[PDB]
């Protein structure tokens, strides 16, 4: 019905876009490009790089953002988390293995590993496997089986002949990994980078229960040395990356400021045909809870070595948007891909196209019905704004906010109209970069409602978002309908 | 569902009540009683009485209203319109007739009629009938047949032996009555009573098309001599009383300020079984258009000579409310009945009871869906107010209004909450006495919104309409949600 | 919507009509007339008449039915039940009373009563009241108050001056009446009239719980002497006539073959404004249960002394049909009214008119959704027949049935199409005369499906119910769609 | 809701699967394997191979089908259509090109091409391009630009350095290709293979309008020499592969027996972001019309060189099923992939899993509402069967059919129950291998309905599709509900 009206034709994008910043796009020029193509949030994967690499990247993001005064860019720190990685190889050159050979794996991490004895970051490895256990390297590339266990090593038997590099992933199927969700390095990165440099999001890797989220809350509340004793309003985004997280989803979602659905280990703990079911379900639950949800399964793989993607990758992003996703995330397409700019631009257009397939009145009633009544005043105002915008055929919903909460609530009810959030706090604007359909205007002051609305309508007119004679809904416990001069 | 919740039990009335004031309830004491039983509007039927009778009644109504300052009483003038009535009988005593006898009817209205020659107010009577024409008197009591036509009289043959009195109704089936909808007397009554004494409603008898309505509009605009050159805002309520009125209903409804469904001639022009179908349709169309509708078919006939009505009469009122009727009107039950006070009280309780059978969310969506979009700003505001009242579970919807238009728009969407209209103009309050579920607060000034709302909430608290901590929606292009202090 | 399409116009009646047979219409000629006007079922009120009067009436009904071979007439016995009546008056002439006088009431039933000492049928009267209790005669006409209680009498004080006749009703507010629901006379009438003469319905007066229904079931099962040891399939219709019945409705409805909502005492035990609520609720519950429901509050009172009714009475029948009533019943309009034929004809046309206001697809989905799944095979076939008829725009639903059960199930789902029930058993056809929209064809044999359908389509074509080329749904666990030759 | 019930758990597949048969799976043993993994239809892509290659494959398919008598395998011929392919390379070895060099292209198809002068099958190539025209080879691999046009050749300038092989695809963007939709070779393949060997489907490449479909109809009706003068019932499945096909879709869809959504040229004529929008619309229109639709964009690309696919590829299949797709098609994954058997098995499990996300009652009402009424008799029967299956909670819908039309109609309404089609004609069974949720029982005779149903139920019991006491709907204009013995 709505999809067919689009075919007869064969309004800016609402779904936010997160880009992972790596070597391929670390410089100012590239970052500006990424903003122009549609980047809402820049992500720093703390599984990679060092302190100096991260800090430079951060400076570059902010410099690039300064070059784009009509844009707001949020910055996300994605924790390393409880991962197991291999060590450095022979001098620095990659190594292949053949089935049948006996490969040794030492826990002496600071050791150069050859074709016979590689290294491992997990010092509790010997006490975590048994004779016969399977050890997976590079996410199902080097499959092995334990033959011996020593004090600080294991000896495995290479089962299938494959090629792997350095710092590769490692997996222990059916084995409990004795690592914390927030280890010592994660704490250091949270306090001494995210809080210290005033970042906007913490993507918490491998969250498994509400207690993981609460530990992060506690860390934030006990570390205010970088903000004059004032607790950061930095947002916790929990990454569901395994079966435990899926089982405890409700608790995690309820505790967090947002959810990210990511590849992780999930594809090894459940049947692969079931992954899409879990994703769809987690997205719907986030929609009902009004918590932002990020879809991030590295959707455009083919765009690390190709100018444009294949159908399957585009339909994945389209269907993620249609499932109700707030943001989509690019991983190695931008971080270390050959065509970082092409991917974002493609992804952006796909999102916009998928959003034309939405039956907005129907979507609104679905969400409105799913929310138990009575609600708080702010949420009621939000609903009425969306209903009003529909009833007068308004082009914009403008919200004057000091925290972004009303803007998040309007976003929850999925208006067809673009939401313009007006605030005096730049941090609030960056925080809103994960909320669907929210554009932000940062102001010097927010005290004079009339003036704020006037400037917002003038600026929106300049940006081709509204025209003279068009209606806009203004919200600030209060709702009004104004006409664009 | 909603009706069955009520059966297990075996919130003030929203439907407004119109009482016809006559001899039985003309005095101050009686009118005070009628207010206490639930009278919203006092109707003066200008088919009966003289100037002095009407003027005394008008004073009594207004004196009674002063004795009840928390109430607001509207005053309606019901026009004589194009009717044919007989003259005075033998001295002043009633006369019966027997079939077979030849009854004469003269057009000399100033004459005492006997059992052989009666009188008639319609001077064009001879030129309107032919030999064999049927002449009905007292709405199907004296059925006669024309035998001779003279210059200023007709001679008929009494077909059925019945008893009749003075000033009785007269009908000419299948004959065109050459009388205007608004004649000399009607103009006189509108200008020198309704406008002159500042009444609130003109109930316009036998409206047949839009042109009839527009003639009344013209009279109103051309007669501002009693209001300092400012046109009155007196409401035109067109009475649908015949087949023509039904045929042209849409035009009439669109031109009018409201609609009254009355008995009139309709039952003689269409099959009686079709009347309730016409009524249901007319009520639905009024609901959709947002125009007040009055149901008035003399619902409680039995209560002119009995303490209480029978089932059929109560169900009639109940179903009128459930059909969507804004007001119910009592006729001979209050005017010249033996039990006026019992009637009103009964009708009030039935209305309240029928209102407990309503599924309010379902009703809201039915009306909201029937309204073509986009709507104008105030209608959108009204909708949003009703939805917000629901979503926070508010007790009141308060509207600050200078005309009553917003209160009418809110009323259209049928909220479960009582609607409180705050105005500075007492005429606006009186005009709203035909909008369902609206109560009116008259204030000295309406300028300071915060103050207006504070005093409205305090007065509502005093009247036990709201309690501390309860929510109320306040509307004045603008909508907000406040908590009662 | 559907009501307005009808107004633009300003298909046979579905709602069945029950007529009470009394002195005014006891003869063959009158009964034939009643059939022609629309009588489905003839009712014998066993509160009145004697054995000889009842038997003659029965013969007349059956003779009249023989004169109408294309009609099926059901016969209903309405039990006297636990009622209290007054005795015979002075010789035989009616008597009036004045407030203040002390009226005596003896329990010596076989005694002529004057203006000072009347008689009473209830011998336990003295042991049922106390000093100060109120005794009501003729349903709130003679209001009295006990002054003395003797062995076989009471002395009351006339409170209000009114006029009453013989055999008048009597009521004891707030007092327990020690009479059985099925007394000795009721049992006699059930066994020696209803079963003996093979009647179709027993309207059981003043049912108060399921045990009352079960007593009647037991009586039927223990009295097969008039039907060769084969238990009668006579249908029990329980009359809800008081508060107890309303409280225990679910149990009563679940036990019975049908429900009648009647005047009884209800109007004295609950507030009168609540009666319509209870009726609406009981009708809906019967619709959901698929049990036939009869509305019978003496809807056309004014038609005992008038040619035509008033609006309130017509709208009552219209709204009863719209509430979901299967049958409407006339009481004193036919039994002892001046215009028995006029009333039925009016009532019939009203029903037909009200049925045009029904949104059939909407009504179907409402009932279909209210019924818990899974259902039995016969009910599933019934639903599919109704859906099929809609989908092909069929004109008839024909059902071959030996018990009428499938015809009752189709009726439950309220098709717009007339339901034609084909059976070889005349008793089955009469039983179906209380099911909405069911017309019956009685056949010699029912074995050849093809032939039965052919004859039914031919007969229906002759009766102007279907035309050549039109579709009909044929049902007999099996459903087919045939075309009318 | 339905997706989340599946997450808590973390019924056979209904969606049909088309496998393309090539070198990797040509032998009997492989084809048996493909049947066991879930192949419904075997596709022969006549763009590759010769007569003997196709004929051997046809025999192997048919021998493999005999080894699985409980399965039914359909056979599809996919036409070469209007395509442009290069010739053979240097002896037989592939050749790479570097940008800047001038590549020649001759129209002499019978020639061995080097790194300087390649060959081409399109003889009108010189008269189709101009100076500056872009010539694409291997679907955007070798981008060239015309420098010279000769009588039977063109000289181009290699724009981008890429590697290509033999028989590669060739495109002329913005140039009209003067080739018929059904040429000499296509006619030959349709008549002397599809019709001659009695295949079940013609997948018609690059259908652009209704006229193309009607030409294929004409060929079929004019060629009955291999079926004794009886026109084949071979299904025309039009492939939408370009913008023209999309523009004229309605006409094509109405003329065709089914629709295939293929990759084709579409991605070169419209923005890539718009492809999924077109696909969703085309699937919806097919669902509404009741025509089978095949989704086939080479969904599992990664499984030509990998054991299992990535997320995007699985979600693509999952969402195709949820969009309403009747069949999914595998291309190079089975034809010449390294892991054919793993691919099919994965795609099958995804389909089944996606099918558990369906709200079956909701889906039924959506389709039922979209169908304009009235429908024809068999469509009404199909609807009623689906509703009855639901209402009694049946396990199977069994249809006795001579053409398969009723089975297709039932399929259209998407019952949760498996549909069992009973036919005497093996071609009918094979034709139904593209209808979702239909399984087929081939019988010697179909005459005795009772017997047919008995044997169908017994065979279904044997296959564990139904148990004793379970209900099944039987359809053969007629519908009934039976219990499995």
Numbering used by the authors:
A (entry chain A), B (entry chain B), C (entry chain A), D (entry chain B): 23 to 32, 42 to 507, 518 to 526
Which lines from the publication concern this structure?
Each CpPyK molecule consists of four domains: N (residues 23–32), A (42–112 and 212–389), B (113–211) and C (390–526).
The final model also contains two sulfate ions, SULF1 and SULF2 (corresponding to SO4 527 and SO4 528 in the deposited coordinates), and two glycerol molecules, GOL1 and GOL2 (GOL530 and GOL 531 in the deposited coordinates), associated with each chain. Instead, there is a glycerol molecule (GOL1) located in the active site of CpPyK at nearly the same position occupied by the ATP γ-phosphate. The GOL1 molecule at the ATP binding site in the CpPyK crystal structure, therefore, has a similar effect as the sulfate ion in the active site. Each monomer in the asymmetric unit of CpPyK binds two sulfate ions at equivalent positions, one in the C-domain and the other at the interface of the A and C domains. In spite of the presence of the sulfate ion, the loop between the two C-terminal β strands in the molecule (residues 508–517) is disordered as seen in other PyK structures without any effector molecule. The second sulfate ion (SULF2) occupies a small pocket at the interface of the A and C domains and is hydrogen-bonded to two NZ atoms (Lys464 and Lys470), the hydroxyl oxygen of Thr471 (all in domain C), and the peptide N atom of Thr103, which belongs to domain A.
